[PDB]
Design a protein around this ligand. Structure first.
Ligand code: HEM
Ligand code: HEM
Ligand code: CL
Ligand code: OH
Ligand code: OH
Lengths: 178, 179
């Protein structure tokens, strides 16, 4: 599959690691670089993988709003990135669809809050629970240096939300584009 | 992992192939048997399908609770017939937003309400495979005593008349008998 992406921490890649912050639960080993590959090698400490998939929660009017402002990846100015792997608890995944949507948006305003940080912050969402991975999602953010304060504020805002009562594991990997 | 299943059409397995109906689009080659394996993966085998069990995508809590009231376990003794139905939906289905797909699925189509009429005759399992890059999007599995083949067939004619099924672009029925 080429909806599949792998991220390999180790000594080679497009991206220098700048910092890793072990927010919640067990961390990831610090390494020099992350190599990103479309598909599924020595001197590598960890590999994470996920796939791009269909929309799970956003309704039409939210999609139209996102599409009006969201930027593309690979802007020349967007030389910083942040890879944030996330795992949610088993109680999250047993809930029904309405219960989860209600937490994600009605209670937490995930989409409304995130829209306040576009178009500065470009984003990608990959899924991995269904592959058996140690994390449920691989989230990817890239932005110009001007926006790193704003991005740090977004994170504090999201982590205070009801949605985040269900996050069990979270790591931040700050990257600079080589 | 544990959540992945493979279905191999060939000369071995636990299920005998009674008929294959090539309902829509290209079919599957007729084979003698189906082997079902927990895991990902075939010498005298003609085709191999796979999918994963996953979280709920559409049902709401009160639907889940009704379903959970009545739905039968798999591998009942009398449940000697099974039907494997691989399904592919169109690209236009997958671009739509979540509310739009939910509204087609239940509000316009009453998938869950219509299906609930046929429990506990029919037991079922749903497996996902679009995200794996498979040639189908879903493997659906249904098992029942012979007493319900008629009713199962009526369900199918019903569901295929629905708005949901206007987005279905490939469908095969593999009818099976347990060995
Ligand atoms: C930058 C602005 C952001 C926007 C516009 C945004 C928007 C979205 C949207 C629309 C979804 C739903 C996709 C769907 O329906 O399938 C989503 C999912 C998700 N986002 Fe964000 N997001 C933002 C920032 C963040 C941040 C900063 C994090 C992590 C620290 C994050 C973590 C996630 C996760 C883990 C999911 C998957 C949720 C689930 O399926 O349970 N998002 N986001
Ligand atoms: C027999 C009684 C049935 C019941 C109780 C039933 C119930 C359900 C439910 C509740 C879902 C949505 C699961 C979710 O929220 O993730 C579903 C999905 C689905 N069903 Fe059924 N169903 C039945 C019959 C059938 C039949 C006969 C077929 C095929 C010919 C079928 C094909 C599918 C497909 C392909 C999906 C996934 C649809 C999607 O995600 O786009 N179902 N069913
Ligand atoms: Cl795989
Ligand atoms: O996101
Ligand atoms: O189903």
């Amino acid at each position: 599959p080429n909806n599949r992406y792998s991220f390999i921490g180790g000594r080679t890649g497009q991206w220098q690691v700048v910092k890793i912050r072990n927010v919640l639960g067990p961390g990831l080993q610090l390494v020099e670089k992350v190599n990103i590959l479309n598909g599924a090698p020595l001197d590598s400490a960890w590999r994470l993988q996920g796939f791009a998939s269909n929309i799970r929660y956003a309704i039409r009017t939210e999609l139209e709003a996102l599409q009006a402002v969201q930027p593309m990846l690979n802007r020349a100015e967007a030389i910083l990135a942040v890879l944030i792997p996330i795992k949610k608890s088993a109680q999250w995944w047993e809930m029904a669809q309405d219960e989860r949507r209600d937490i994600f948006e009605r209670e937490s305003h995930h989409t409304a809050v995130g829209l306040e940080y576009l178009p500065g912050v470009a984003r990608r969402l990959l899924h991995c629970r269904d592959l058996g991975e140690e994390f449920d999602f691989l989230t990817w953010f890239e932005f110009a240096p001007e926006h790193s304060s704003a991005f740090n504020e977004l994170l504090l805002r999201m982590r205070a939300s009801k949605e985040w009562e269900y996050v069990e594991r979270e790591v931040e990997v700050w990257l600079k584009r080589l």
